[PDB]
Amino acid sequence: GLTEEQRMMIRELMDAQMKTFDTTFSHFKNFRLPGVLSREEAAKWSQVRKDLCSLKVSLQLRGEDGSVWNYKPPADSGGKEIFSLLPHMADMSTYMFKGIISFAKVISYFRDLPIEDQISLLKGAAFELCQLRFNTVFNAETGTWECGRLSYCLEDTAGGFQQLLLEPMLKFHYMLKKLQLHEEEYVLMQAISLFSPDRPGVLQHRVVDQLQEQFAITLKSYIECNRPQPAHRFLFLKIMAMLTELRSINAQHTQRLLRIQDIHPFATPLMQELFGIT
Amino acid sequence: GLTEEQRMMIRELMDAQMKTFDTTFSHFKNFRLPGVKVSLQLRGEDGSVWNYKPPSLLPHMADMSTYMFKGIISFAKVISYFRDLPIEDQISLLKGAAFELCQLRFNTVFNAETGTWECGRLSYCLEPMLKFHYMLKKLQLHEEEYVLMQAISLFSPDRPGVLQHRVVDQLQEQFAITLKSYIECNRPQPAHRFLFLKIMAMLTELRSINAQHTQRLLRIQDIHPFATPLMQELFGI
Amino acid sequence: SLTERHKILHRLLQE
Amino acid sequence: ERHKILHRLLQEG
Ligand SMILES: Cc1sc2c(c1C)C(c1ccc(Cl)cc1)=N[C@@H](CC(=O)OC(C)(C)C)c1[nH]nc(C)[n+]1-2
Ligand SMILES: Cc1sc2c(c1C)C(c1ccc(Cl)cc1)=N[C@@H](CC(=O)OC(C)(C)C)c1[nH]nc(C)[n+]1-2
Q1: Cβ–Cβ < 8 Å for D6, A116
Q2: Under a CB-based contact definition with an 8 Å cutoff, are residues A76 and A54 in contact?
Q3: CA-based, 20 to 30 A from B106: which of A14, A74, A244, B73?
Q4: Every domain of chain A and the residues it spans
Q5: Strands, DSSP E only, in chain A?
Q6: Residue pairs between chains B and C whose CB atoms are closer than 8 Å
Q7: CB neighbours of B82 closer than 8 A, spacing ≥ 6?
């Protein structure tokens, strides 16, 4: 069984999640939407095109009457149009980041850390925790993140499923969903991600490293206690490998975000702080 | 192979169509939108598409119809034979033919393979009205035939309130004779057999569809208000 | 007669 | 001051 120190750890993480994750997105109310009836510089525009072509999503808005507005983005012509979704996604990301900051704030182990390490941990893990929360609303049968009345649908092409697996962020979401994790495993993953001692700017490397290990030990014990099936022999290491992949996707997304921001400013004030944009 | 009077008649009609039919809906603006069974697609210049799937659309359609009606009033005003009529007969003629000329203009953007009226920036995807549209489209009419059908409908002497019946009747006959001559001298392929008489029959069917729609809307407006001020005038509501 | 009941239509025809 | 919004969000209850 789990130790009571461990059962309480999970209880505090789960209460934090319940209080700070708007799973129905019912309080995401104000956001921008794409309009209705709307040398080195050129090399930078080229790379950003290849960044933005990596993830093609359509936006679905479902009304309370059952009607649906579907937005299909334009195909890459010669500029501007490739950015039509960026305001909306900035508002969506900023909304999610506020939720992650609120999650970290209610964790005892986080509040007790020096504030500049709190800031450093959040700047390094914000995208990762948002993606972990996004995985819980990912419908792998429809390739859709179901965000209440909003839905983000992967645009299906000629290659089908195997084409989507070419994008590391997409392969991440499919592979994690297949692990069929419980809410408790998800929230422990978020804690291990948040308390990464190796983020830039963390001074108390040893304290965070020790806390990260206690979350990892609690995750290992939870799996042993509630999933005794020999089918889950390596589940814990499989989760950890997903976290290693999330760090690589985090680095690539940061680099991509920065390039897009250079040629077309979109980041909200909170995003600017999280990503180091002046 | 037309007389100059007839060849001129078609020129004025075709120039009027070109100047008053916003085929792309490029100037349709400030319209109400569903949620803000017809499916609506709104296409931006960038190639982006907003699609509305139904479960509310009536306000939008009233705005779109009124826009089309404005184009049809503008069409009539730029035709010499219409402008020379007493204003009261101009009004009576436009009240009786507005729905018909809009449906004729909508038929020219109708795609019968998809059941979609493709109006540029707007598209409407899917009744005797539907039947009319599929049957008219099958005739593969030219712009010249459509615009003459619009004239024959516009200059209907039997419309309620028309006073100069004979003037309007003699004008209609001259349009109908010009249509007949156009087809004989410009369309010999056997698919277009009896085309003139077939068009004249479609116009009679459009007359009945117009009657049935007016009666429907005169009753619905009592319960659900949607008609724009101009629609209320045109349909006698 | 028709002119006063059709003020908008009359306006659009005149303009 | 580089993290004014983050500081405020962490301070609030
Ligand atoms: C404007 C912004 S802000 C942003 C993104 C964009 C585009 C992108 C993104 C960036 C680069 C490329 Cl090439 C593709 C997407 N991803 C989202 C994740 C998301 O909200 O999308 C899914 C819901 C998972 C589909 C995200 N997380 N954190 C941030 C800061 N962003
Ligand atoms: C609210 C309104 S106002 C209206 C309509 C609706 C719905 C309908 C209509 C009414 C009844 C059904 Cl059974 C179907 C459509 N049609 C339009 C024109 C239209 O949309 O044409 C195509 C369909 C594009 C050819 C039209 N013309 N004049 C009027 C008064 N209306």
Answers
A1: no
A2: no
A3: A74
A4: 1-278
A5: 57-62, 68-72, 138-139, 144-147, 150-154
A6: 36
A7: B76, B90, B93, B154, B155
Q: By what method was this entry solved?
A: X-ray
How far from each other are the two terminal CA atoms of chain B, in whole angstroms?
A: 45
Burial of A200 (C-beta count, 10 Å sphere; 0-12/13-18/19+): exposed
In contact, A169 and A254? CB cutoff 8 Å: no
At CA A77, angle to CA A74 and CA A78, rounded to 5?
130
Q: Decide: residue A276, CB within 10 A, 0-12 exposed, 13-18 middle, 19+ buried.
A: exposed
| Backbone dihedral angles phi then psi of residue B61, each to the nearest 5 degrees | -65, -35
Instruction: With CA atoms as reference, report the closest residue to A239 among A259, A256, A219.
Output: A219
**Residue A68 in contact with residue A61, Cβ under 8 Å?**
yes
Listing from the earlier edge strand, what are the strands of the sheet with A68-72?
A: A138-139, A144-147, A150-154, A57-62, A68-72, B49-53, B39-43, B122-125, B116-119, B110-111
Cβ–Cβ gap A69/B48 under 8 Å:
no
C-alpha separations of A82 from B33, B42, C7 in Å = 25, 18, 48
Q: Residue A90 CA: which ligand is closest?
A: 1
What number does the ligand 1 atom closest to the CA of A127 have? 28
Interface test with C, best of B66, B79, B85, B91 (most C CBs within 10 A): B91
To the question of whether residue B33 is assigned a binding role by annotation, the answer is no
Is it true that domain A1-278 has CATH number 1.10.565.10? yes
* Contact call for residues B95 and B236 (beta carbons, < 8 A): yes
Cross-chain Cβ contact C9/B94 below 8 Å: yes
Which residues, other chains included, contact B96 with Cβ-Cβ below 8 Å and sequence gap of 6+? B156, B159, B160, B210
Q: Where would I find the beta strands (DSSP E) of A136-207?
A: 138-139, 144-147, 150-154
Q: Which residue of B has its CA nearest to A85?
A: B48
State the architecture of B1-237 in CATH terms: Orthogonal Bundle (1.10)
The two structure tokens encoding residue B99: 């729905």
DSSP annotation of A78 reads S
What's the CA angle centered on A240, arms A196 and A14, to 5 degrees?
70
Phi, psi of A2 (to 5 degrees): -90, 145
Q: What is the resolution of this structure in A?
A: 2.2
